[PDB]
Design a protein around this ligand. Structure first.
Ligand SMILES: CCCN(C)C(=O)CCCCCCCCCC[C@@H]1Cc2cc(O)ccc2[C@H]2CC[C@]3(C)[C@@H](O)CC[C@H]3[C@H]12
Ligand SMILES: CCCN(C)C(=O)CCCCCCCCCC[C@@H]1Cc2cc(O)ccc2[C@H]2CC[C@]3(C)[C@@H](O)CC[C@H]3[C@H]12
Lengths: 234, 234
């Protein structure tokens, strides 16, 4: 049911991790990229656990699970960051001990442009009063949607049909949440659209972020890493 | 009204332009990039005329009109291409005299990857049976939405509020179209979501296309070009 979908997603939420650095040492000696890389690397392991709990995800082939996570990982990191930063105007809560403003983004060439986008997205979330139940629906939508247009064998046709069925169930769930909040039918469809259009901007920001990461010529999980992490034993 | 919005958008549609090349000359001697650049350059002029007819667009400042078109131009070109290609499986109808398959995209390094995405998007449009009235709504949404998160003066706050009001009116229009087609309330909100999620993929494809164009180090309209074209006399 829609209420069961909501509880499942909320129950699956990953933990909020801390940055790893000597708090009794001067900040200017740290590698900003080192801290951010190390944080994301640890978040990615919990990402895989969360993804396996998104209803419908483990019904797909391992190959298609990997394709979806390879497309979506940075969008999923970024929507979590924007959500964890919503109540910190002007700052990005990478971790509770790593709350950064835009001037701190200037320590890495090209990064302040990305921080500005993330900050503006968190502002948009605040303006709309995004609720946590909506947040978990949108994050699941990113996981299922971001790689689905870039997979026509029979099995692929079946995998795409299943993804679109799950996506439709999440839509039904978002509408149900909004009807419960007292929105009119018109406000429900307007708010659904506003939320989904924000996903376009998250995609944009992920593309700009990935371009920035690739420009360091080093900071990106490989196909084989994600495959090994998703291909678990019992 | 919603019906008036639909008629206004349909009436504003740009013409379908032809590629410029000697049809009595061998194809292998043409510059593929030359043909594609020259086509897009001519489409951009008609783009500006169309944008000025999207309800609400000319109410914005010239500066914000330019920002929106600078963000959105390639997405708007690409959604038109995908729409003009819907009934040509396996081909991209850049122009009626320039219908290209994926092997023709291999003549420019890096381009076949983009052609594959565009082709897969046109397939998705065919699968959903996208209607022309829906197409014009989605194209207007791209224009209004793609640059709205990347503009907090009072005037900017007013410009963003107006954009979001127009966007909400287009949502209402898309729902109205779907109710008229006989869809249930559930199918209406599911189809609205499916359409808006495709816009995320169009954004993605524009980002990959822009990366490809910038990699030629040359093929992109400048801020000053768009400003001069939008800043018309009477
Ligand atoms: C084959 C084995 C592979 N082997 C050897 C490995 O070590 C495998 C590890 C491979 C994964 C390594 C990925 C590291 C990604 C770091 C992302 C970084 C942290 C972060 C964290 C967040 O929560 C939310 C968002 C963001 C990003 C936002 C956009 C930013 C600011 C960009 O502009 C520059 C930095 C970016 C931020
Ligand atoms: C300051 C004055 C400036 N000055 C001097 C000028 O000349 C101002 C002209 C500046 C504008 C020039 C932009 C040229 C853009 C060409 C885009 C090209 C044609 C096209 C047409 C479509 O309808 C739909 C889509 C697409 C694109 C899809 C993605 C593709 C395949 C990429 O992978 C490589 C080619 C791309 C396709």
């Amino acid at each position: 049911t829609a209420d069961q979908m909501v509880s499942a997603l909320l129950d699956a939420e990953p933990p909020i991790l801390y940055s790893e650095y000597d708090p009794t040492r001067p900040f200017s000696e740290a590698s900003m990229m080192g801290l951010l890389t190390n944080l994301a690397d640890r978040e990615l392991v919990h990402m895989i656990n969360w993804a396996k709990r998104v209803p419908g995800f483990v019904d797909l082939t391992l190959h298609d699970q990997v394709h979806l996570l390879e497309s979506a990982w940075l969008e999923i990191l970024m929507i979590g960051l924007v959500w964890r930063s919503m109540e910190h105007p002007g700052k990005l809560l990478f971790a509770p001990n790593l709350l950064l403003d835009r001037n701190q983004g200037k320590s890495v060439e090209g990064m302040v442009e990305i921080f500005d986008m993330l900050l503006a997205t968190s502002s948009r979330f605040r303006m709309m009063n995004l609720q946590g139940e909506e947040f978990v629906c949108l994050k699941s939508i990113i996981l299922l949607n971001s790689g689905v247009y870039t997979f026509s064998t029979l099995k692929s046709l079946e995998e795409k049909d299943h993804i679109h069925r799950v996506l439709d169930k999440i839509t039904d769930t978002l509408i149900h949440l909004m009807a419960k909040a007292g929105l009119t039918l018109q406000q429900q469809h307007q708010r659904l659209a506003q939320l989904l259009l924000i996903l376009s901007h998250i995609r944009h920001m992920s593309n700009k972020g990935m371009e920035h990461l690739y420009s360091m010529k080093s900071v990106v999980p490989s196909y084989d890493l994600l495959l090994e992490m998703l291909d678990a034993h019992r």
